[PDB]
Symmetry: C4
Subunit: 347 residues, 4 copies
């Protein structure tokens, strides 16, 4: 009867619920450092990872991300031979960093072998429910065979789940159940945790083991990314904000005179070909990845400057939030003004 009475006690927050409180600062946005260390064999210049989705990251995107100082995860919706080849294609081009997504299946180990042979830097054990026993066991099975391999496991949204994956052998934990722009998990199954609260809860546990977390999904604007990092995440994972980029898979298509690209959930009907937990759609074309990355990092620099963070470590450990209502949100966006042109970082 303790489980019965504790059903509705927990409370969760997401990005649009909060703002970062300005702090004393003697650092300029130009001066701040945005480097992150996921592991001793995996370091990034910028805290950005492109999602391992069929409409987001393949060879070209992974190469582009690695060159902006980020990281790309090759999706698993292709043959083992195809993924190992694309991973190699990224490694061919200057010894850039590259990751590959692997699902929890029978052929999982076989796929990982061809990936490790292709000198992949990290594998992403992707599953909808990262707190499942099957996922945990497969992490252990993989950890045993490759102790020197970077293992990124997810997705989870609780501290209990984070501890479970870390103990299984995961050195990076991916956080996010339902916040995705193309996701319908919370709608069709009713399951999830508000992403900021999820990140905070998991980071609270991950810190105790010196393990980094990845904030994955739900990021609409560059400010959301700053919030995610300040909530405990080392690095974020983006899907929709990279999907309209030239380097992302798919072809540019015209709808009502504008340029779009296909963006679909990996749990959508189209991506599968279980009940679907994703949606299919399109996002505006945005040209080269460099322009989008520049606005994102530039937003992050401004944010860190406001908070007085010389590095992301200070940001995670010192940044304070303040909660706001819907009226606060509307004030936070432009209001009572007819916007006449698009800014490079707004709509």
């Amino acid at each position: 009867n303790a489980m019965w009475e504790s059903k509705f006690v927990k409370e969760g927050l997401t990005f649009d619920d909060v703002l970062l409180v300005p702090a004393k600062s003697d650092v300029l946005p130009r001066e701040v450092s945005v480097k992150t260390v996921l592991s001793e064999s995996l370091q990034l210049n910028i805290p950005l990872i492109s999602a391992g989705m069929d409409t987001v990251t393949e060879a070209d995107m992974a190469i582009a991300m690695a060159r902006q100082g980020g990281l790309g995860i090759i999706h698993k919706n292709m043959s083992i031979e195809q993924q190992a080849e694309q991973v190699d294609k990224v490694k061919r081009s200057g010894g850039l960093l590259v990751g590959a997504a692997v699902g929890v299946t029978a052929d999982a180990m076989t796929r990982i072998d061809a990936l490790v042979k292709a000198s992949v830097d990290a594998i992403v054990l992707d599953t909808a429910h990262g707190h499942s026993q099957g996922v945990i066991d497969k992490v252990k099975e993989v950890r045993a065979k490759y102790p020197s391999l970077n293992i990124i496991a997810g997705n989870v949204a609780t501290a209990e789940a984070t501890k479970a994956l870390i103990e299984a052998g995961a050195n990076v934990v991916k956080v996010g159940i339902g916040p995705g722009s193309i996701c319908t998990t919370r709608v069709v199954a009713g399951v999830g945790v508000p992403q900021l609260t999820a990140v905070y809860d998991c980071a609270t546990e991950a810190r105790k083991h010196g393990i980094p977390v990845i904030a994955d999904g739900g990021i609409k604007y560059s400010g959301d990314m700053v919030k995610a990092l300040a909530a405990g995440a080392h690095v974020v994972m983006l899907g929709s904000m990279f999907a309209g980029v030239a380097e992302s898979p798919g072809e540019t298509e015209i709808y009502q005179g504008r340029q779009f690209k296909v963006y679909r959930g990996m749990g959508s009907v189209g991506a599968m070909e279980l009940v679907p937990e994703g949606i299919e759609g399109r996002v505006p074309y945005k040209g080269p990845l460099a322009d989008t990355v520049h606005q994102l990092v530039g937003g992050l620099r401004a944010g860190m400057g406001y908070c007085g963070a010389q590095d992301l470590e200070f940001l995670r450990e010192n940044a304070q939030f303040i909660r706001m209502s819907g009226a606060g949100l509307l004030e936070s966006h432009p209001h009572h003004v007819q916007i006449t042109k698009e800014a490079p970082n707004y709509s």
Copy 2:
């Protein structure tokens, strides 16, 4: 006196106010059990019941519901003779389960007499106010004559009301005051309780007596059903999500080049006129055509299996006794649904 200061102390949540929290899980959605026991003689393989509304459930729907593992409540907007024929029709169709709705009226027993002869499996004593004395007196009057008959009573939204119905003879209690898609009770009378809190409060009381509660109304997506079952409900009742299937009463009509089917509240002007001083408490409308019932049901159950899998629930009871929620704001809701992307294809379980 002390009632004056307590006017605004109570707080209520609904489906869009919360989310289910993922937990340890050794079970796959493929392997979960979705069966339920409502009574000694009533067992459903899926937790679904189609509403007893004149635009939702008749003989054809009740057959299709039963063949899916669910239950259909034949509506009362027809003669006593007609309703008995349809109950009999569902029964002759291979031993399928079938329910039937009865209103709190003078000739209620007469309707119930003909329903029992036709071997109806359950009777729904449906009122707008389940905590009315007339309904309570009716349940006793029916339990006395038919000690073996499955009686479902409603609608209620408070623990005290559930206690009254259970002690009166009801062996199943139906929860829901105002959450209906077609319902204006809360708007025109100002009375109601947010459904998820209602389900939770009623399930709390009914649990003490070993009595199942039905979550009736307010469910628009499959996730809302999983939340309702996790809140303490044994089964759920759907009107809106069933009103568009092929087996539902009424014919298809065209809007925007696509097909729609009529759906209206039983307290709407149209429904009251067919059934017959009271002011209406529902609206008349239409919902998208969705084809055969099997497709809708498969989506519904599929969402439940996934959600139960997330919670690590091997069966519905574990989910009822262990599932934890987390409260969220409007921003949380906005994030929960798809966002900032233009959808190009309707998903089988989304819009």
Copy 3:
């Protein structure tokens, strides 16, 4: 002391769309409950409804219709003293019906009140923007002194302190509402107000201690709001917009895009003020709703259903026993129809 500084943001407010009335044990059917109500021995109404004292809401034709329905009408003050006195006499001679008249806080207040009393008016409505103003208190005291037996209704107020002040001044009815008006912009232009349900509840709390009835004025857009207002401690509610489009309300029916509408505007709007201070209301139009009888039946019927759910035999049980439950915006969306295409229009919804 730093008290006033530290208590600035302490209070919280609730409106109709923030709450629901909780269903309770009921030994009564909607057709059996009594909706009658007493404001004073000389002023008893069969239905808890008063039509607002506005130039686009209540004149003689409206006051007569309201009274015949068992309600009350307040003749507005945007006319000469002689005219308003005539309007009262007309209603009073139309079968001996109850009729009220609005009076403002001006120098000629006493003159106008003398005429209305001479015309045998039943209630005087001392109407001002700020009921807790010193000018209002004094005017109430003057009138109570000259007319010890005259019904005095004073407002508007939104706090208990204000309510206590008008009661001690000599008012036997207190009207509540600062800003909730559909037509109002006071909260937008002055930044001043109190969420109407909390307002009614705070003022009723004070007024209960004195046996003074309270009127819930403005903010009511559906019949359920009226039930909530009455359950929050009000004896009677006052309506503007829901009565604005009936046939008996002032103003001819105008045609806008085929559909027939009726002008409804704030008493503090630019147009009304003409018939130094900036506007605190807007000018607009509402759909023509036909005879008052059809609107009243929907409202009363909503109340009967409401009282039925709460197990209230009369309005006194409602005020004393009815409990609310607070809900989020998600709760409100569930409360209204949703995820359906409305094909026809219910007599009591839009």
Copy 4:
């Protein structure tokens, strides 16, 4: 302790609250609307026009001063041009006029010219008032011009207000992100809900006898009253002054309605004249300033009359708020009635 305090703070904005009516023996006609920001800076009306290139130049500053207010000459022009603007307002009857200065190396050079032009106040105008550079720049100016009115901003915290007062500023400007044209809270994720920001800053500034300026996010006259009631001596407006005839730029016609350009100083357009923290848009033409001012001051007199405030100091010390939900706000505006004509003080 720093990690666990991240989400404890709550913030309020204008649309979250209402002013509670109090006992009153004062009529709106009789109230005192004056304000003293310093010994050498007194306003007959609590209004300041924003230092933006689409809000305030010489013509706006003149009109504002003659109404009893103040105009701030923006800095998107040469040192010589700005000194001429200040002089222009000065030879128009000896009117009060302020000028905007940013934190650059040549800031002193510009200030030297503005002082020579007999300016009444210089506004040290930056995105992050709690920056060390801003604090240092305040010290330099105070050390050279001990009698010069220095407005320093912008800030949103008591700690930042304290630091600016300590640095030598004699007026503090409050607001991080509430601006109608502002995207700072969206792109950088940083900010504090304005009404709480004013209150938190006034609480500190009260101790030093320093007045604060509530800058940004005011869309109706009632918002201004709330801002003042929350502790502000005076408010600064942008969008409500940008469609005024005396503002820079000219009138454009779109579908019969007249408009005027309004953009943030952080927008691409203004910067061109880092990533942007504003947008470019347009507001409706409102005609001569006197009409907008009349409505604003009249709403304030209404509010003060409701609160029983004879003067603005009474309002600051005594006015009480009540919190409300989105249903409260919805009720607070006109509702369920189709508006047939524009009121002078509403949309």
